[PDB]
Amino acid sequence: NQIDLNVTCRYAGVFHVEKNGRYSISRTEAADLCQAFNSTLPTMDQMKLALSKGFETCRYGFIEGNVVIPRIHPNAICAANHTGVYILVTSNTSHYDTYCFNASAPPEEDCTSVTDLPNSFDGPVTITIVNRDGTRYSKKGEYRTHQEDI
Ligand SMILES: c1ccc2c(c1)CCNC2
């Protein structure tokens, strides 16, 4: 009964979360997951400001209303060489990573570790925050509120 949450640096409060290192989060689970980080799904404008501060990934994830990849450098294997906030237009499938936005984060790049899931609720799951530098924080809890997701 375990879930790993890989988190990135924050850029203007926006960060990327990958559940168990694979595309596996539904749009409902994504909102719950951000809620557990005292965060919301980013708006498009919040994501564009994050991009301008240095945020990019090579992973599709939910924002409010769309599924996107922020890209600074053109890479052929990431969003087909696009730069900017790339918007996924056509897909058969429903599960991706998520982006989250925390308003209480620093205004620019914050590459300090994340060391809590402040708004998770009581539950049976061992939830582990994994930072890119390997540091980890675990707690027992839950964050999924939709039965379809559990
Ligand atoms: C924290 C821990 C692992 C990973 C990330 C962040 C991002 C890319 N996928 C691996």
Coordinates of N, CA and C and ligand atoms in Angstrom, one line a residue:
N1 N 0.9 -1.2 0.0 CA 0.0 0.0 0.0 C 0.9 1.2 0.0
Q2 N 1.5 1.5 -1.2 CA 2.6 2.5 -1.3 C 2.4 3.3 -2.6
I3 N 2.7 4.6 -2.5 CA 2.7 5.6 -3.6 C 3.9 6.5 -3.5
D4 N 4.7 6.5 -4.6 CA 5.8 7.5 -4.7 C 5.3 8.6 -5.6
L5 N 5.7 9.8 -5.1 CA 5.4 11.1 -5.8 C 6.7 11.8 -6.1
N6 N 7.1 11.8 -7.3 CA 8.3 12.4 -7.8 C 8.0 13.9 -8.0
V7 N 8.7 14.8 -7.3 CA 8.4 16.2 -7.5 C 9.6 16.9 -8.0
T8 N 9.3 18.0 -8.7 CA 10.4 18.9 -9.2 C 10.6 20.1 -8.4
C9 N 11.6 20.8 -8.8 CA 11.7 22.3 -8.5 C 10.5 23.0 -8.8
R10 N 10.2 24.1 -8.0 CA 9.1 25.0 -8.3 C 9.6 26.2 -9.0
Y11 N 8.8 26.6 -10.0 CA 9.1 27.8 -10.8 C 7.9 28.7 -10.7
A12 N 8.0 29.9 -10.0 CA 6.9 30.7 -9.8 C 5.7 29.9 -9.2
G13 N 6.0 29.0 -8.3 CA 5.0 28.2 -7.6 C 4.6 26.9 -8.4
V14 N 4.9 26.8 -9.6 CA 4.5 25.6 -10.4 C 5.5 24.5 -10.4
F15 N 5.0 23.3 -10.2 CA 5.9 22.1 -10.2 C 5.2 20.9 -10.8
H16 N 6.0 19.9 -11.2 CA 5.5 18.7 -11.8 C 5.6 17.6 -10.8
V17 N 4.5 16.8 -10.8 CA 4.4 15.5 -10.0 C 4.2 14.3 -10.9
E18 N 5.0 13.3 -10.7 CA 4.8 12.0 -11.4 C 4.5 10.9 -10.4
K19 N 3.4 10.2 -10.5 CA 3.0 9.2 -9.5 C 3.6 7.9 -10.0
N20 N 4.5 7.3 -9.1 CA 5.1 6.0 -9.3 C 5.9 6.0 -10.6
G21 N 6.4 7.1 -11.1 CA 7.3 7.2 -12.2 C 6.7 6.7 -13.5
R22 N 5.4 6.7 -13.6 CA 4.7 6.4 -14.9 C 3.4 7.2 -15.0
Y23 N 3.0 7.4 -16.3 CA 1.7 8.2 -16.5 C 0.6 7.4 -15.9
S24 N 0.0 8.0 -14.8 CA -0.9 7.2 -14.0 C -2.0 8.0 -13.2
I25 N -2.1 9.2 -13.5 CA -3.0 10.1 -12.8 C -4.1 10.6 -13.7
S26 N -5.3 10.4 -13.2 CA -6.5 10.9 -13.9 C -6.8 12.4 -13.5
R27 N -7.7 13.1 -14.3 CA -7.9 14.5 -14.0 C -8.5 14.7 -12.6
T28 N -9.3 13.7 -12.1 CA -9.8 13.9 -10.7 C -8.8 13.6 -9.7
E29 N -7.9 12.6 -9.9 CA -6.8 12.4 -9.0 C -5.8 13.5 -9.0
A30 N -5.6 14.2 -10.1 CA -4.7 15.3 -10.2 C -5.1 16.4 -9.3
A31 N -6.4 16.8 -9.3 CA -6.9 17.9 -8.5 C -6.7 17.5 -7.0
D32 N -7.0 16.2 -6.7 CA -6.8 15.8 -5.3 C -5.4 15.8 -4.8
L33 N -4.5 15.5 -5.7 CA -3.1 15.4 -5.4 C -2.6 16.8 -5.2
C34 N -3.0 17.8 -6.1 CA -2.6 19.1 -5.8 C -3.1 19.7 -4.5
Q35 N -4.4 19.3 -4.2 CA -5.0 19.7 -3.0 C -4.2 19.3 -1.7
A36 N -3.7 18.0 -1.8 CA -2.8 17.5 -0.8 C -1.5 18.3 -0.6
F37 N -1.0 18.9 -1.6 CA 0.2 19.8 -1.5 C -0.3 21.3 -1.2
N38 N -1.5 21.5 -0.8 CA -2.0 22.9 -0.6 C -1.8 23.7 -1.8
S39 N -2.1 23.1 -3.0 CA -1.9 23.6 -4.3 C -3.1 23.4 -5.2
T40 N -3.1 24.1 -6.3 CA -4.2 23.9 -7.3 C -3.6 23.5 -8.6
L41 N -4.4 23.0 -9.6 CA -3.9 22.9 -10.9 C -3.6 24.3 -11.5
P42 N -2.5 24.4 -12.1 CA -2.1 25.8 -12.6 C -3.1 26.2 -13.7
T43 N -3.3 27.5 -13.8 CA -3.8 28.1 -15.0 C -2.8 28.1 -16.1
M44 N -3.3 28.4 -17.4 CA -2.4 28.5 -18.5 C -1.4 29.7 -18.3
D45 N -1.9 30.8 -17.7 CA -1.1 32.0 -17.4 C -0.1 31.7 -16.3
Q46 N -0.5 31.0 -15.3 CA 0.5 30.6 -14.3 C 1.6 29.7 -14.9
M47 N 1.2 28.8 -15.7 CA 2.2 27.9 -16.4 C 3.1 28.7 -17.3
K48 N 2.6 29.7 -18.0 CA 3.5 30.5 -18.9 C 4.5 31.3 -18.1
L49 N 4.1 31.8 -16.9 CA 5.1 32.6 -16.1 C 6.1 31.6 -15.6
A50 N 5.7 30.4 -15.2 CA 6.7 29.4 -14.7 C 7.7 29.1 -15.8
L51 N 7.2 28.9 -17.0 CA 8.1 28.7 -18.2 C 9.1 29.8 -18.3
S52 N 8.7 31.0 -18.1 CA 9.6 32.2 -18.3 C 10.7 32.2 -17.3
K53 N 10.4 31.6 -16.1 CA 11.4 31.5 -15.0 C 12.3 30.3 -15.1
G54 N 12.1 29.4 -16.1 CA 13.0 28.3 -16.3 C 12.4 26.9 -16.2
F55 N 11.1 26.9 -16.1 CA 10.5 25.5 -16.0 C 10.3 24.8 -17.3
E56 N 10.9 23.6 -17.4 CA 10.5 22.7 -18.5 C 10.5 21.3 -18.1
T57 N 9.8 20.4 -18.7 CA 9.8 19.0 -18.5 C 9.7 18.3 -19.8
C58 N 9.7 17.0 -19.8 CA 9.5 16.2 -21.0 C 8.3 15.3 -20.7
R59 N 7.3 15.8 -20.0 CA 6.2 14.9 -19.6 C 4.8 15.6 -19.7
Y60 N 3.9 14.9 -20.3 CA 2.5 15.5 -20.4 C 2.0 15.5 -18.9
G61 N 1.3 16.6 -18.6 CA 0.6 16.7 -17.3 C -0.6 17.7 -17.3
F62 N -1.5 17.4 -16.4 CA -2.7 18.3 -16.3 C -2.4 19.7 -15.8
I63 N -3.0 20.6 -16.4 CA -3.2 21.9 -15.8 C -4.7 22.1 -15.8
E64 N -5.2 23.3 -15.4 CA -6.6 23.6 -15.4 C -7.1 23.7 -16.9
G65 N -7.9 22.7 -17.3 CA -8.4 22.8 -18.7 C -7.7 22.0 -19.8
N66 N -6.4 21.8 -19.6 CA -5.7 21.1 -20.7 C -4.6 20.2 -20.2
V67 N -4.0 19.5 -21.1 CA -2.8 18.6 -20.8 C -1.6 19.2 -21.6
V68 N -0.5 19.5 -20.9 CA 0.6 20.3 -21.5 C 2.0 19.8 -21.2
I69 N 3.0 20.3 -22.0 CA 4.4 20.1 -21.6 C 5.0 21.5 -21.8
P70 N 5.6 22.0 -20.7 CA 6.4 23.3 -20.9 C 7.7 23.0 -21.4
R71 N 8.1 23.7 -22.5 CA 9.4 23.4 -23.2 C 10.1 24.7 -23.4
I72 N 11.4 24.8 -22.9 CA 12.3 25.9 -23.2 C 13.1 25.6 -24.4
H73 N 13.8 24.4 -24.4 CA 14.7 24.0 -25.5 C 14.0 23.1 -26.4
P74 N 14.2 23.2 -27.7 CA 13.6 22.3 -28.7 C 14.3 21.0 -28.5
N75 N 13.5 19.9 -28.3 CA 14.0 18.5 -28.3 C 13.1 17.7 -29.1
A76 N 13.7 16.9 -30.0 CA 12.8 16.1 -31.0 C 12.0 15.1 -30.3
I77 N 12.4 14.5 -29.1 CA 11.7 13.5 -28.4 C 10.8 14.1 -27.3
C78 N 10.7 15.4 -27.2 CA 9.9 16.1 -26.2 C 9.0 17.1 -26.8
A79 N 7.7 16.8 -26.9 CA 6.7 17.7 -27.5 C 7.0 18.0 -29.0
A80 N 7.7 17.1 -29.7 CA 8.0 17.1 -31.1 C 8.7 18.4 -31.5
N81 N 9.7 18.8 -30.8 CA 10.6 19.9 -31.0 C 10.0 21.3 -30.7
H82 N 8.8 21.4 -30.1 CA 8.1 22.6 -29.8 C 8.8 23.3 -28.6
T83 N 8.7 24.6 -28.6 CA 9.0 25.4 -27.4 C 7.7 26.1 -27.0
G84 N 7.7 26.6 -25.7 CA 6.5 27.3 -25.2 C 5.7 26.2 -24.4
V85 N 4.5 26.6 -24.0 CA 3.6 25.6 -23.4 C 3.0 24.8 -24.5
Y86 N 3.4 23.5 -24.7 CA 2.9 22.7 -25.7 C 1.6 22.1 -25.2
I87 N 0.5 22.2 -26.1 CA -0.8 21.7 -25.6 C -1.1 20.4 -26.4
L88 N -1.4 19.3 -25.6 CA -1.8 18.0 -26.2 C -3.1 18.2 -26.9
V89 N -3.2 18.0 -28.2 CA -4.5 18.1 -28.9 C -5.2 16.8 -29.0
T90 N -4.5 15.7 -29.4 CA -5.2 14.5 -29.8 C -4.6 13.3 -29.0
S91 N -5.4 12.7 -28.2 CA -4.9 11.5 -27.5 C -6.1 10.6 -27.2
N92 N -5.9 9.3 -27.2 CA -7.0 8.4 -26.9 C -7.2 8.3 -25.4
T93 N -6.2 8.7 -24.6 CA -6.1 8.2 -23.2 C -6.2 9.3 -22.2
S94 N -6.4 8.9 -20.9 CA -6.9 9.8 -19.9 C -6.0 10.1 -18.8
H95 N -4.9 9.3 -18.7 CA -4.0 9.3 -17.6 C -2.6 9.9 -17.9
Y96 N -2.2 10.9 -17.1 CA -0.9 11.6 -17.4 C -0.2 11.9 -16.0
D97 N 0.8 12.8 -16.0 CA 1.3 13.3 -14.8 C 0.4 14.5 -14.4
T98 N 0.8 15.3 -13.4 CA 0.1 16.5 -13.1 C 1.1 17.6 -12.9
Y99 N 0.6 18.8 -13.2 CA 1.3 20.0 -12.6 C 0.5 20.6 -11.5
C100 N 1.2 21.2 -10.5 CA 0.5 21.9 -9.4 C 1.1 23.2 -9.2
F101 N 0.3 24.1 -8.6 CA 0.7 25.5 -8.3 C 0.4 25.8 -6.8
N102 N 1.5 26.2 -6.1 CA 1.5 26.6 -4.7 C 1.8 28.1 -4.6
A103 N 0.8 28.9 -4.2 CA 1.0 30.3 -4.2 C 2.0 30.8 -3.2
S104 N 2.3 30.0 -2.2 CA 3.2 30.4 -1.1 C 4.7 30.0 -1.3
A105 N 4.9 29.5 -2.5 CA 6.3 29.2 -3.0 C 7.0 30.5 -3.4
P106 N 8.4 30.5 -3.5 CA 9.1 31.6 -4.0 C 8.8 32.1 -5.4
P107 N 9.1 33.3 -5.8 CA 8.6 33.8 -7.1 C 9.3 33.3 -8.3
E108 N 10.5 32.8 -8.1 CA 11.3 32.4 -9.3 C 11.6 30.9 -9.1
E109 N 12.9 30.4 -9.3 CA 13.2 29.0 -9.2 C 13.5 28.7 -7.7
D110 N 12.8 27.6 -7.2 CA 13.0 27.1 -5.9 C 13.4 25.6 -6.1
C111 N 14.6 25.3 -6.0 CA 15.1 23.9 -6.1 C 15.4 23.3 -4.7
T112 N 14.9 23.8 -3.7 CA 15.0 23.2 -2.4 C 14.1 22.0 -2.4
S113 N 14.4 21.0 -1.5 CA 13.5 19.8 -1.4 C 12.1 20.2 -0.9
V114 N 11.2 19.3 -1.3 CA 9.9 19.2 -0.7 C 9.9 18.2 0.4
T115 N 9.5 18.6 1.6 CA 9.6 17.7 2.8 C 8.3 17.5 3.5
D116 N 7.2 17.7 2.9 CA 5.9 17.3 3.5 C 4.8 17.4 2.4
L117 N 3.7 16.6 2.8 CA 2.5 16.6 2.0 C 1.4 17.2 2.9
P118 N 1.4 18.5 3.1 CA 0.8 19.2 4.3 C -0.7 19.0 4.4
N119 N -1.4 18.6 3.3 CA -2.8 18.6 3.4 C -3.4 17.2 3.0
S120 N -2.6 16.2 3.1 CA -3.0 14.8 3.0 C -3.9 14.5 4.2
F121 N -4.8 13.5 4.1 CA -5.7 13.2 5.2 C -5.4 11.8 5.7
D122 N -6.1 11.5 6.8 CA -5.8 10.2 7.5 C -6.0 9.0 6.4
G123 N -5.2 8.0 6.5 CA -5.3 6.9 5.6 C -4.2 5.9 5.7
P124 N -4.3 4.8 5.0 CA -3.5 3.6 5.1 C -2.3 3.5 4.2
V125 N -2.2 4.5 3.3 CA -1.1 4.4 2.2 C 0.1 5.0 2.7
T126 N 1.3 4.3 2.5 CA 2.6 4.9 2.7 C 2.9 5.8 1.5
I127 N 2.9 7.1 1.7 CA 3.1 8.1 0.6 C 4.5 8.6 0.7
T128 N 5.3 8.5 -0.3 CA 6.7 9.0 -0.2 C 6.9 10.1 -1.3
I129 N 7.3 11.3 -0.8 CA 7.8 12.4 -1.6 C 9.2 12.0 -2.0
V130 N 9.5 12.0 -3.3 CA 10.8 11.8 -3.8 C 11.3 13.1 -4.6
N131 N 12.4 13.7 -4.1 CA 12.9 14.8 -4.8 C 13.9 14.4 -5.8
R132 N 14.3 15.2 -6.7 CA 15.2 14.9 -7.8 C 16.6 14.5 -7.3
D133 N 17.0 15.2 -6.1 CA 18.3 14.9 -5.5 C 18.2 13.6 -4.6
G134 N 17.1 13.0 -4.6 CA 16.9 11.7 -3.9 C 16.4 11.8 -2.5
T135 N 16.4 13.0 -1.9 CA 15.9 13.1 -0.5 C 14.4 12.7 -0.5
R136 N 14.0 12.1 0.5 CA 12.7 11.5 0.7 C 12.0 11.8 2.0
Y137 N 10.7 11.9 1.9 CA 9.9 12.1 3.1 C 8.7 11.2 2.9
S138 N 8.4 10.4 3.9 CA 7.3 9.5 3.9 C 6.3 9.8 5.0
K139 N 5.0 9.5 4.7 CA 4.0 9.6 5.8 C 2.9 8.6 5.4
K140 N 2.1 8.2 6.4 CA 1.0 7.4 6.1 C -0.2 8.3 5.9
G141 N -1.0 8.1 4.9 CA -2.2 8.9 4.7 C -2.9 8.5 3.4
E142 N -3.7 9.5 2.9 CA -4.4 9.3 1.7 C -4.7 10.7 1.1
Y143 N -4.9 10.8 -0.2 CA -5.3 12.1 -0.8 C -6.4 11.9 -1.9
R144 N -6.7 10.7 -2.2 CA -7.7 10.4 -3.3 C -9.1 10.5 -2.7
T145 N -10.0 11.3 -3.2 CA -11.3 11.4 -2.7 C -12.4 10.8 -3.6
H146 N -12.0 10.4 -4.8 CA -12.9 9.8 -5.8 C -12.7 8.3 -5.8
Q147 N -13.7 7.5 -5.6 CA -13.7 6.0 -5.6 C -13.1 5.4 -6.9
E148 N -13.5 6.0 -8.0 CA -13.0 5.6 -9.3 C -11.5 5.6 -9.4
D149 N -10.8 6.4 -8.5 CA -9.4 6.5 -8.5 C -8.6 5.5 -7.6
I150 N -9.3 4.9 -6.7 CA -8.7 4.0 -5.7 C -8.6 2.6 -6.1
Ligands
LIG1 C1 11.9 13.7 -8.8 C2 12.3 12.3 -8.7 C3 12.4 11.5 -9.9 C4 12.1 12.1 -11.1 C5 11.7 13.4 -11.2 C6 11.6 14.2 -10.0 C7 11.4 14.1 -12.4 C8 11.6 13.2 -13.7 N1 11.4 11.8 -13.4 C9 12.2 11.3 -12.3

